[PDB]
């Protein structure tokens, strides 16, 4: 890994190399110029128990739309962003050889995600391991564990860092600081993560 810019991690759905995709579905639209995901992936990203991982958002009842939109974006960012190389790492697991860790998610992005999920429910603080997939999709391990979202995710930082086993590491930097990754951004103003990756790919460059 000498070049961590404009590259795609090696996961279950990513393409081998970045490339235009003017057919990406709604939320994944900001990545039409250059994406790591396919038209199909972006489409499935907006569906419940998608073809991607059969993940069920409604494990503790229907998750509020205002909250699911944040999980859909995360899917877009994770499955389409070509600016995550500075955080790519090899884990070697049944479904993905590589993945991202400690991505510096902007302070706001994490606080907004957290906020919009207050009215939602969940039974775990780690959505990567622990589910009961017997039914074909994940269901609560301990069915009686359902509680308000903030019960398992007390603070924004706990939600963004823990939920996806540390794929994120909420930064103190805010949107626009050029030092943090944004999962929400207006493509008409440009992709702000290009500059961020470049910055970090340099801080770890050389030695």
Ligand X SMILES: *[C@@H]1O[C@H](CO)[C@@H](O)[C@H](O)[C@H]1NC(C)=O
Of 107 and 117, which CB lies nearer to ligand X in the complex structure? Answer: 107
For position 189 contacting ligand FOL by CB under 6 A, the verdict is no
Number of Cβ within a 10 Å radius of residue 154: 12
134 interacts with, out of ligand FOL, ligand X, none, CB within 5 to 8 A per kind: ligand X
| Contact of 49 with 137, CB cutoff 8 Å | yes
For residue 130, state whether it binds ligand FOL (rule: CB under 6 A): yes
The binder of 50, among ligand X, ligand FOL, none, by C-beta within 5 to 8 A per type, is none
β-strands 121-122, 96-100 pairing: unpaired
Q: Is 29 annotated as a binding residue?
A: no
68 to each of 11, 48, 182, how far by Cα in Å?
22, 10, 17
- Show Cβ contacts of residue 126 under 8 Å, excluding neighbours closer than 6 positions: 162, 163, 165
Binding mask 35-74 for ligand FOL (x = CB under 6 A): ------------------x-x------------------x
- Rank residues 132 and 147 by Cβ distance to ligand X and give the closer one: 132
Residue 41 · residue 79 · CB < 8 Å: yes
The answer on whether 56 is annotated among ligand-binding residues is no
Give the nearest distance from C-beta 44 to ligand X in angstroms.
5
60 contact partners, CB below 8 Å, separation of at least 6: 120, 121, 122, 123, 140, 146
The answer to whether 22 is a known ligand-binding residue is no
Q: Is 185 in the site for ligand FOL (CB under 6 A)?
A: no
Positions in the binding site for ligand X (CB under 6 A):
40, 43-44, 51, 132, 134-135, 141, 172-173
Give the interface segment with ligand FOL, choosing from 117-125, 129-137, 170-178, 190-198 (CB under 6 A): 129-137
State yes or no: 47 annotated in a binding site.
Answer: no
Which residue number, 2 or 129, has a Cβ lying nearer to ligand FOL? 129
Minimum distance between the CB of residue 29 and ligand FOL, rounded to whole angstroms?
A: 18
């Amino acid at each position: 890994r000498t070049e961590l810019l404009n590259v795609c991690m090696n996961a279950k759905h990513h393409k081998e190399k970045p490339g235009p995709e003017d057919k990406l579905h709604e939320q994944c639209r900001p990545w039409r110029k250059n994406a790591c995901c396919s038209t199909n992936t972006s489409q499935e990203a907006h569906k419940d128990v998608s073809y991607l991982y059969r993940f069920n958002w409604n494990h503790c009842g229907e998750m509020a739309p205002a909250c699911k939109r944040h999980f859909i974006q995360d899917t877009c960012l994770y499955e389409c962003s070509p600016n995550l190389g500075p955080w790519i790492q090899q884990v070697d697991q049944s479904w993905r050889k590589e993945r991202v860790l400690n991505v510096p998610l902007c302070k706001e992005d994490c606080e907004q995600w957290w906020e919009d999920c207050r009215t939602s429910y969940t039974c775990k603080s780690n959505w990567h391991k622990g589910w009961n997939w017997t039914s074909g999709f994940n269901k609560c391990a301990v069915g009686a564990a359902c509680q308000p979202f903030h019960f398992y995710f007390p603070t924004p930082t706990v939600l963004c860092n823990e939920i996806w086993t540390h794929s994120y590491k909420v930064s103190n930097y805010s949107r626009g600081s050029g030092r943090c990754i944004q999962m929400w951004f207006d493509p008409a103003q440009g992709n702000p993560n290009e500059e961020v990756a470049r910055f970090y790919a340099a801080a770890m460059s050389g030695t």
